[PDB]
Every structure is written in structure tokens, then in C-alpha cells.
Amino acid sequence: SVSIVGIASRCAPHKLGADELEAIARRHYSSTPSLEKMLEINRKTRIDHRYSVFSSDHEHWHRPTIPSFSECDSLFKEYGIPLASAASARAIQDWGGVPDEITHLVAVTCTNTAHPGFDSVLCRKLGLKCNVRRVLLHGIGCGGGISAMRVAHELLLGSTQQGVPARALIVACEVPTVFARSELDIMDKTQDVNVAMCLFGDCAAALVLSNGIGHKASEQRPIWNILNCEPTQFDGTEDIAHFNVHDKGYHAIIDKRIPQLTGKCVPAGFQSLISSTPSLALEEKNYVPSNYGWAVHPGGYAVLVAAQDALGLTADDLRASYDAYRDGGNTISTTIIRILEKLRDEHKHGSNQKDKLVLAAIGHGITLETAILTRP
């Protein structure tokens, strides 16, 4: 089996509560209908705390000009990469192995574009071996954590086929608040309310996966085994979510139809996942969502609610997903790892969890990424 053997996450350090966002908005823009509507919505997201790499007194929030794309890149390098290094180091510490033994690095972000990519820098910071096998995923957004898991899972199975040890570091790093000034400016000029301003926060998170070959005493035993992962792209959904490039960074388009789409896509993806899993596809009970633990990427509050109802679950089933959302908001590709961390921590402290766990996240496409994890 391929197993998860290390987990860690690191939210940015500075709170970006509703009062903080309002202060930023009103500092730079006079009252307009879109500004007032955004601020009203901002207080109703049911997010208690979001985090930014930028403190309230940082020039990012006070400067009169919108950051150039080059500045946005430099800010990601300055603030995002250290967050990623820390999360990665901590996941390697959780694993217990040595950086030298990492054979694969699978990285993901949708808040930076660079050549070389941030994964290259991370190899140096962490002291990974010169022949570590890197993949930097692009284009997927909120689907990215599970996507990285899917990719790493199969790469590790490939090493199992060769009979050699493999250990993958998965690293997700997102600094969406870098683009907050640009988004505010676009909202003011167009008067199109952009709820991205209300939902997103900064975070990095990491996993270590193992193919179980060449296990050493220093290594943590499997936390979960990864049984199967399956993506689905849905026709007729292209316009639903976009993160489009422009002169001052990326601009988010978040269609109001996402929660309703979620309610239809998630159960369809679940059925498809189970159907594609030979060890489970034949028994009828395996097609009942309540027979599994669940972790759902919280694209927004209404996304959790839509998934919850459509799958026949309770809010308590998704407690860890609501908790992650409430304390950190939507941190894009990192959120699913934050939720896994919460679930792991609860189990350590005595919680009763089911033996199978389903991960699900809606990403650009529209794509649904899923995975099934099992208790060892």
C-alpha cells in the first residue's frame, strides 16, 4: 500500500477578520454599492478567522498603488516560500525520516507563476537530494491538494512496480492575499461584487507519503492507506469558476451556481469513485456516503452545506471541514491537508472515526478530485 506517514500545516500569522478587511477597503475606496454589498457578505461567511502573510501595518495594505505582477511574484517568494518550507519541514519531522530519503516532490499553487517554480527553491531550503523527482502542478486551484495526492499515489505505485523505496513530499502553498489589492480595485471599477475578497486566506501545508518499501525504524507507521483516487471533469461547466491572468495578477470569478453544482457533482463523483475501486465496487453498502468518514474542501459555507445535504450526512460528520473553514477560511489547495491534520489529531486524542475516509474537492474545470483513504 501507499500510505500517508507525515502531515503538517501552517497558516499565515496575521488575522484578517471582518474589521480588518473593512479597514483596508475603506482606507482606499469611497462607499459604492458593490463595496457595501461585499462588506455585508463578508460578515456572513461564518469564517471566524482568516490569515494573511501581511500584518495590519504592512505596506501591502497602506500603499496607494496596486502591486505589479512582478511585485506579487516577489511577495510570494518572500512570504509564501518560507511558509511552504516550514510546513514541509514540519511534515518531514512528523514522518521522522531524513530529507535525503525523499525521492519525489509534488508541489501545487495557484497564487504564483515562476520559472523556476517554487518547488525548485524548496529543494534547496530543505536540503533535498540533487536527483529528487519534482512535479509542480498548475491550473487546478481548489482541487490541488487532492490532485497532488492522486499524482503522488501513482508515482509511488510506479516505484513499487520497480521494487524500490519511494517517499513523496506533497507541498501546497497559497498566498491569495497577495492579490487582495488588485481584486478590491477591480471590484470598485466594475462594481461586480467579488466574494473572493471574503473567503480566501494564506496557508501552506504538506504530506509525506510512502510506498512502504525499505521501511526504517525512524519512520512513522501509516496513518492512512490511500486506496484509490479518481478525478471527474463535468461538461458544460467551463464558465463556473476561473482564476484569470491580467496585468496585476490573477482575478477570481466565482459563479453563484457553485453550491448547486456541488450538490450534483459530489454524489456523482462518489459513486464513480466506489465503482472504480475493485475492492469495494461490488457491495451495496459501499455506495452509502454515511458508511464513510468525509473531508470536503470548504469552497465556501454554502458548498459544505450543499455537499452535506446531497450526501445524506450531518454537520457533525463534516465537523473537521467546518472547523477548518471557520478557522482559516478557504485556503485553496491546502485546506484538505488542514482537515486531514485535524482528523489525525482528533484520533490521537481518542475520537471514534470510521475505517474508510473520502476526500472530495471541487476545482477548476469544473473538476471533482476524490480519494478514498483507509485505516491501517
Added chain:
Amino acid sequence: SVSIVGIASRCAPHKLGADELEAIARRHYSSTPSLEKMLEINRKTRIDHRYSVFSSDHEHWHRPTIPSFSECDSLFKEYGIPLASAASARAIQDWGGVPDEITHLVAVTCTNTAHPGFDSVLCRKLGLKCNVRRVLLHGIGCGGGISAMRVAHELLLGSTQQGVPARALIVACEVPTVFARSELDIMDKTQDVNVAMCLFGDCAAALVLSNGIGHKASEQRPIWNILNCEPTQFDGTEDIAHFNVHDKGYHAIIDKRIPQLTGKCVPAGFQSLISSTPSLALEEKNYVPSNYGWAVHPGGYAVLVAAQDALGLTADDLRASYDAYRDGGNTISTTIIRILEKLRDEHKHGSNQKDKLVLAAIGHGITLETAILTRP
């Protein structure tokens, strides 16, 4: 074994010769020393033909303003994606299988950033199945073709581990001429000569790979088997090559030290590759470059020469690499596939080639990507 079973490429249709580039440059810029130096270098690259998606009368070459990043994205969608669709379709045609049986898609570009990424569009254009397993690689540049091969190779071994059929479509798509207007403008303003203006052309290319499981009569037999792929990142080389984001796209920095670095990195990477290949690592003869066929990404004319001399090879050994460079220039992640295509075509027409073939490409990092292919 994992095998290559389909190959195709498609350069853009419009020639961008020395006269054409000079016409474009002088149309928008009065003479300066850096302009004259660039144009002088341009006629010495030993590239006979480069191609652009933009014809001589296209507004891209006549507009008085520099394209915004949003326009650059739209242009890639308008011109790049069709190029990728055509190359992909042709590779699938070469393979002979059904688009529905493609299990994995591994895509790469360094001339577009989008959410969803261009791979998502390609799935729809080609009619790939809803659960096709996509990866869009980022951050690697000229290393990208071999990088995609490395990733696809391991993913397919992962399916072999599971005992199921796997067929990967690899697609590389590069439209660097989209950024030519921005690059010209930066060169005028800074007076920093940018040889990127002289080297790069537009192209898409594709491979189909198979893990050999569930082989159908309709499918082409292995062209090459992929034995092993090995990347190396070299410390102390970070600033040697960068493709950095800014308001109007990406800007290339091409250090004069690249050919010198190539001459050191390639033999080192070759030795590492063989050392890491169990079926070859023991015999002394296997560490001699002349005992293999070679395909080297032509970063520029001087890069080919540096690799040739350092490996003890002749220009004739690298004939297909020089040929690809001469007719198409540096097409970034697609060039290595163009060379494989040339080598396939020559062999089909009766040429004598060696049993083993090494692919090598210098990419951002600085990274060297390598692969060893064998005749079935």
C-alpha cells in the same frame, strides 16, 4: 515495459525569418545599439526557419501598444490550443488507439498560465473520457518535454503495478512569439540585449505512451521502450535562466554562461543516469556516450556544440537535433519531441541507428532532465 507508441508535432504556420523580425523591430523602434546588436546576433543563430502563429500582416505585429497579459492569455487560447489539439490528434492517429482509452494526460507549457489550464480544454476538444487523469506541469521551461516523459513513465508503471491498462497522452504547447512585443519593448527601454528574440518559435508536439497492458490489434507496436529517466538540479545556478512574470507577460533572462554550463552538466547527468540504471550500471562500456544515440534539446546553437564536444560526439551524431534547431529553432518543451519524430522518420526510411538513445535537456533550476530509450 513502458513504450512510446505514437509521435507527432506541429510547428506554427508562418515563417519568422531574419527579414521578418527586422521588419517588425524597425516598424516600432528607432535604431539603438541594443537593437542593432540583437538583429546582428539574429542573423548568426544558424536557424534557417522559425515559426510564429502570427502571420506578417497580423495585428500582433502592427499594433502600437504592447499586448496586455489578458490578451496574451487569449492569444494562447486562440492560437496555441488549436496547435496542441492538432498535434495531439495526430499523435493519437499515429498510435491508432481510441481517444476513450487514454487514461492519463500530462501537459506542459511555459507560455500560458490559466485556471483551468489548457489541458482541461484539450480534454474537451479531443473527446477524452470524463475521468481522464490530468497533470499540467509548470516551472520547468525547456526541460518540459523530457519532464513530462519522466512523469508519464512513472504513472504508467503505477498502473502496471495495479495490473491495468494505461495509455498516456503527453502534450507540449509553446507560443513564445505571443511575448515578442513585450520582449522587444523591454530590450529597447533597458538596452539589455535579449537573445530570446532570436531563438524561440511556436510549436506543439505530442507523444502517446503505453504500459503494454491490454494491447489491442489497432495499436502501434512500441517505437522505443523507456528504460529510465533521471533529473538533476545543480546548486549555484539559480540565476542562470529565468522566465519571470510581469504586467505584460513573461520576460526571459538568458545568461551567457549557459553553453559553458551545458558542457559540465550534460556529461555529469549522463553518468548519473547510467549509474541509476541497474541493467546498465555495471558494465564499463555503458558509460561511454558514443555507444548511444543522442537527442539534445537545442537551447541555442552553442548549447549543441558544447554538449557535442563534452560528450565526445560528432555533429553527425546529433544530426536530428541540429536539423530540428535549423528548421524551427528553440521551441522549448516541444523540441525534444520534434527530434524523436525526426529519428523515428529516418529509421522508418532505412537509417541505421543504435540500440539505445539518450535524451537530454537543460531547463530552469538549472535542471537537467534525461531519459534512456531502447529499441524493442
